[PDB]
Amino acid sequence: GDFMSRFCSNLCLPKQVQMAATHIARKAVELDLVPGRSPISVAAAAIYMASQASAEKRTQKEIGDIAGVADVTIRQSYRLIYPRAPDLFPTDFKFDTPVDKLPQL
DNA sequence: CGGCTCGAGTGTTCGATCGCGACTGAGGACGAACGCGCCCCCACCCCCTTTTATAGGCGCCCTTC
């Protein structure tokens, strides 16, 4: 969450996406869904997922470029969080794309 | 066969010249104390390599669009 602020800022993402990502991240770590990947890598994928759950979608490479992590590392981290993509979202959220329609990579 | 009035030549201070040097200040050039920085040396301590085990990050290539 300490990096949710500036990165989402650097993407000019609205707080609701930013906050949604934070929950997604928070829920994921409490459940230890990703016992390996760096939390920033995990956070970026959450941000990605979040951005992919809003109109403010971005390509992994752009996100990857902002976070500095490898685009495959997000892709892997995404693969780890994707099984719970629907339930990881906060209860106070408004989809722009169904979790079913969340892309795979 | 005696006095007495020139002219000529020499010596000693003193008046009159007068060029030179001393005294003072300003200007110009050079030097020394002061000064700056680099280069050199000594001192102190890191750098490289391998093996075995793990795992997260990641770069490159091959293929397809």
From Swiss-Prot:
Subunit structure: Found in a ternary complex with TATA box-bound TBP. Part of a TFIID-containing RNA polymerase II pre-initiation complex (PIC) that is composed of TBP and at least GTF2A1, GTF2A2, GTF2E1, GTF2E2, GTF2F1, GTF2H2, GTF2H3, GTF2H4, GTF2H5, GTF2B, TCEA1, ERCC2, ERCC3, TAF1, TAF2, TAF3, TAF4, TAF5, TAF6, TAF7, TAF8, TAF9, TAF10, TAF11, TAF12 and TAF13. Associates with TFIID-TFIIA (DA complex) to form TFIID-TFIIA-TFIIB (DAB complex), which is then recognized by RNA polymerase II (Pol II). Found in a RNA polymerase II initiation complex.
Effect of mutating K27A: Abolishes autoacetylation, represses transcription activity, does not inhibit its association with chromatin to promoter-specific regions and decreases the association of GTF2F1 with chromatin to promoter-specific regions
Region annotated Necessary for TATA box-bound TBP complex formation, chain positions: 33-105
Family indicated by similarity: Belongs to the TFIIB family.
The encoding gene: GTF2B
Stretches forming Sequence repeats: 7-83
Protein known as: Transcription initiation factor IIB
Organism: Homo sapiens
Full protein stretch here: 212 to 316 of 316
Outcome recorded upon mutating R84E: Inhibits interaction with RNA polymerase II
Function according to Swiss-Prot or TrEMBL: General transcription factor that plays a role in transcription initiation by RNA polymerase II (Pol II). Involved in the pre-initiation complex (PIC) formation and Pol II recruitment at promoter DNA. Together with the TATA box-bound TBP forms the core initiation complex and provides a bridge between TBP and the Pol II-TFIIF complex. Released from the PIC early following the onset of transcription during the initiation and elongation transition and reassociates with TBP during the next transcription cycle. Associates with chromatin to core promoter-specific regions.
Residues with N6-acetyllysine modification: K27
Annotated residues for binding of DNA: R37, K61, A70, T73, R75, R79
